[PDB]
Design a protein around this ligand. Structure first.
Ligand code: HG
Ligand code: HG
Ligand code: HG
Lengths: 286, 285
């Protein structure tokens, strides 16, 4: 519980110095009472629909693996959303090791890979009408001081039971083919985007590889186990951390490939993604 | 508040506590902590359509406040049951008051125009909110509640839309203009058309559809009176349940209700112009 005047001077009148980042339709600030506030960036036709979907899901749906909405402010012709600040920051920031931080151990990886997996199952089976997260990525997964994950960016979340202009630019590299070439946003578009972030925690590489040709990490691993070999995928395992059992590594490449499939019918559901993902956690420690 | 209070004060949502059943919700009466409230429950029972309307209620009630809009005091998401609770307005809905359902004292004119002004103030507020203009799309004499001091409160924003000149896939429409019915077009001027119906419904005290065998509508009847025999005949349909109002008063409201319910949307006046007319005609009373 806070007031607007606490934020007005707290964010130093939205000072450019007190900014954590500017995303698609927001520009996140840092506030202390510490919090992170998302200020509505003002074509309201589509930007406003997103701000709604964000506040819709957070108020109506709660889960320990979802960044909990603290409060909302609609005052002084300004809309904004306040959030509890995450100490570990973005997943993408920690497994890429920005700021020369410590790499993520394998047990935390499979830990926050299950945590996010548990939430996306919760959302796919909400009672009124199932909701599709849509914009899931290693950039929208935050980690607290205990390194436990939190979802973000429910702006392109849709309820289910179809327009490419409505897309999120940064989330392009996670979208399936039926979403791009056919516009069909399915229930299985989250398991697709989740199979890619499994690849990102197995191989500490970026979403799109920095090679001169600028090829996708999905397509690279898509061709290794398709032609060369399943163990050839293991050549790209993140070397910044000590090794892990070959059965733990194999089961995750086996799963990520089935999740990040072009054809939608052959793509699994989050429950069995979570079943195979918790059993893999035992293969690590044994 | 607490959802445990609601489930008790409604007796597991028993039939004896519902005040009315809307198309997509269920309204119940709940009294907790020496105060009474009106809970409105999602008609759980397709999925996608009814759910979107649910969000329309919650969005505009949390983002936009005005003295002439029924506040949302709490909302609950637990036990898969999604309900909205409202401060119970003890003077019922405008419709029930114009019809004197419980043999209530019929509304005097000064209250009748106070209500018209209050609702026009709220609709003006919504049409000019900063992020995107919101249009109500569900104005009715049954969606206008009256507090203890007979001050109008606007409800039922389930059909509301955010506009930057719009469209609605069409898949009991007595207040909607001919472009919404025939062409699906819905706009800011759609509210003023429905607001004109209310002015007609306030002046006459009649129902929107007259309870006769042929079921002729109100505006269609008043149209005939004003086109054929002019404004002098419209004044014969003033509400006889209350003493006569000044002719200058009643004459300006009929002309106003005529423009507000103009058949073609291009001509209908902006809600700002209406509030100006409603204020200057209260002085004439
Ligand atoms: Hg692979
Ligand atoms: Hg008339
Ligand atoms: Hg007149």
């Amino acid at each position: 519980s806070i007031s607007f005047q606490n934020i007005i001077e707290g964010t130093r009148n939205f000072h450019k110095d007190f900014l954590i980042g500017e995303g698609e339709i927001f520009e996140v600030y840092r506030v202390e009472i510490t919090y992170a506030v998302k200020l509505f960036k003002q074509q309201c036709k589509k930007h406003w629909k997103r701000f709604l979907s964000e506040l819709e899901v957070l108020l109506l749906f709660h889960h320990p693996n979802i960044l909990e909405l603290a409060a909302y402010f609609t005052e002084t012709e300004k809309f904004c959303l306040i959030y509890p600040y995450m100490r570990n920051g973005t997943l993408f920031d920690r497994l890429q090791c920005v700021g020369d931080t410590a790499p993520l151990p394998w047990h935390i990886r499979i830990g926050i890979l299950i945590g996010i997996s548990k939430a996306i199952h919760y959302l796919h089976n909400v009672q009124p009408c199932s909701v599709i997260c849509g914009s899931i990525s290693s950039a929208n997964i935050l980690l607290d001081d205990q390194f436990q994950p939190k979802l973000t960016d429910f702006a392109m979340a849709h309820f289910r039971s179809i327009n490419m202009t409505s897309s999120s630019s940064k989330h392009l590299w996670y979208m399936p083919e039926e979403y791009i070439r056919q516009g069909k946003l399915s229930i299985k578009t989250d398991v697709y985007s989740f199979g890619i972030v499994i690849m990102e925690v197995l191989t500490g590489c970026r979403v799109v590889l920095d090679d001169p040709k600028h090829i996708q990490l999905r397509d690279l691993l898509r061709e290794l186990m398709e032609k060369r070999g399943l163990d050839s995928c293991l050549s790209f395992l993140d070397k910044k951390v000590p090794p892990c059992p070959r059965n733990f590594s194999a089961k995750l490449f086996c799963l990520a490939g089935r999740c990040a499939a072009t054809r939608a019918k052959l793509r699994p559901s989050m429950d069995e993604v979570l079943n195979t993902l918790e059993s893999t956690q035992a293969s690590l420690y044994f």
